[PDB]
């Protein structure tokens, strides 16, 4: 028909988001919602590909990827964050394998920061499910879908059977994922790539009950003129139901850092403009910045001013 078409596959499209929520029909190219929630991952870059500008409070986050790729600075970042604005993190350890060193030079408060290390991977989502119930979290995260041993391998009897990791898992999601939506509280579980580059570990549910999935893999070796200062890390949102999917965006993890937030100005500010490049040389309206992207950045680190400058007039070229 003539807009008749067009006039009822938004008739249809409506009652499905009705039916089964937004998130359920979308097209890759509108720019729709907004919440004024949203925590910030500490990448501009991430944060825009992700629509909303952050991990959608309330929903569950999944974020996935092979061994010494960035996954959990992400997360240290997202929670970093959430807390340096009232909010107070707990942390479910199963990898026994945190620095709190590192996640202090990022931002947290490791202090105020509640970690818990369960004995059977069925006691840990008990533990991270009251724990969400009181409603005094913000963001928690699961280290290790992985991890999650159910009682009985543990201890071997129960039983050569199996379903137990996906089911103690699917068990817990649909409990926990009522709660989060209620509460408030993201949820974020750091998961794996048992080769990859795999298709679950336990994942089935996770994959479903997850609102936002982000495919972390460590692209380049970032290269610092003596040996190294840190990675390129790239992150594939291959799931997004708050905002539209498959986006995807860069930065860079300095060795003993984290994210580079002046690093991740320079390449917005650059594909955005807002910063022209002569050469090796960025220059910001008039005035030039630095003469190499690391001499930029070192400039950007120490005036705040411009850099927010940046930062701010990004956000606004977007929201």
Same mark, same amino acid.
């Not at 129960?158 to 993201?186: D, E, F, I, P």
């Not at 690391?294 to 977007?318: M, P």
């Given at each position: 028909?003539?807009?008749?078409?067009?006039?009822? /596959?938004? $008739?249809?499209?409506?009652?499905?988001?009705?039916?089964?929520?937004?998130?359920?029909?979308?097209?890759?190219?509108?720019?729709?919602?907004?919440?004024?929630?949203?925590?910030?991952?500490?990448?501009?870059?991430?944060?825009?590909?992700?629509?909303?500008?952050?991990?959608?409070?309330?929903?569950?986050?999944?974020?996935?990827?092979?061994?010494?790729?960035?996954?959990?600075?992400?997360? $240290?970042?997202?929670?970093?964050?959430?807390?340096?604005?009232?909010?107070?993190?707990?942390?479910?350890?199963?990898?026994?394998? %945190?620095?709190?060193?590192?996640?202090?030079?990022?931002?947290?408060?490791?202090?105020?920061? /509640?970690?818990?290390?369960?004995?059977?991977?069925?006691?840990?989502?008990?533990?991270?499910?009251?724990?969400?119930?009181?409603?005094?979290?913000?963001?928690?995260?699961?280290?290790?879908?992985?991890?999650?041993?159910?009682?009985?391998?543990?201890?071997?009897?129960?039983?050569?059977? !199996?379903?137990?990791?996906?089911?103690?898992?699917?068990?817990? %999601?649909?409990?926990?994922?009522?709660?989060?939506?209620?509460?408030?509280?993201?949820?974020?579980?750091?998961?794996?790539?048992?080769?990859?580059?795999?298709?679950?570990?336990?994942?089935?549910?996770?994959?479903?009950?997850?609102?936002?999935?982000?495919?972390?893999?460590?692209?380049?070796?970032?290269?610092?003129?003596?040996?190294?200062?840190?990675?390129?890390?790239?992150?594939?949102?291959?799931?997004?139901? !708050?905002?539209?999917?498959?986006?995807?965006?860069?930065?860079?993890?300095?060795?003993?850092?984290?994210?580079?937030?002046?690093?991740?100005?320079?390449?917005?500010? !650059?594909?955005?403009?807002?910063?022209?490049?002569?050469?090796?040389?960025?220059?910001?309206?008039?005035?030039?910045?630095?003469?190499?992207?690391?001499?930029?950045?070192?400039? %950007?680190?120490?005036?705040?001013? !411009?850099?927010?400058?940046?930062?701010?007039?990004?956000?606004?070229?977007?929201?």
């Amino acid at each position: 028909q003539a807009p008749d078409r067009e006039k009822a /596959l938004e $008739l249809a499209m409506a009652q499905i988001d009705k039916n089964f929520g937004k998130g359920s029909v979308m097209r890759l190219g509108e720019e729709v919602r907004q919440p004024i929630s949203v925590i910030p991952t500490g990448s501009i870059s991430l944060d825009v590909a992700l629509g909303i500008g952050g991990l959608p409070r309330g929903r569950v986050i999944e974020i996935y990827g092979p061994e010494s790729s960035g996954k959990t600075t992400v997360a $240290l970042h997202a929670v970093a964050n959430a807390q340096a604005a009232g909010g107070i993190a707990a942390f479910i350890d199963a990898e026994h394998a %945190l620095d709190p060193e590192y996640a202090k030079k990022l931002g947290v408060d490791t202090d105020s920061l /509640l970690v818990s290390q369960p004995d059977t991977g069925e006691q840990a989502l008990e533990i991270a499910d009251m724990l969400v119930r009181s409603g005094a979290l913000d963001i928690i995260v699961i280290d290790s879908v992985a991890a999650l041993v159910p009682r009985a391998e543990i201890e071997g009897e129960m039983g050569s059977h !199996v379903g137990l990791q996906a089911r103690l898992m699917s068990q817990a %999601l649909r409990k926990m994922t009522g709660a989060l939506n209620n509460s408030g509280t993201t949820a974020i579980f750091i998961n794996q790539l048992r080769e990859k580059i795999e298709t679950t570990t336990g994942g089935k549910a996770l994959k479903f009950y997850a609102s936002v999935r982000l495919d972390v893999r460590r692209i380049e070796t970032l290269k610092d003129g003596t040996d190294a200062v840190g990675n390129r890390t790239r992150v594939k949102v291959v799931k997004n139901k !708050v905002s539209p999917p498959f986006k995807q965006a860069e930065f860079d993890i300095l060795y003993g850092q984290g994210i580079s937030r002046e690093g991740s100005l320079i390449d917005m500010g !650059v594909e955005h403009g807002f910063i022209r490049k002569s050469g090796s040389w960025f220059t910001y309206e008039g005035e030039q910045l630095g003469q190499g992207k690391e001499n930029a950045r070192k400039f %950007l680190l120490e005036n705040t001013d !411009v850099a927010n400058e940046i930062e701010k007039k990004i956000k606004e070229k977007l929201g």
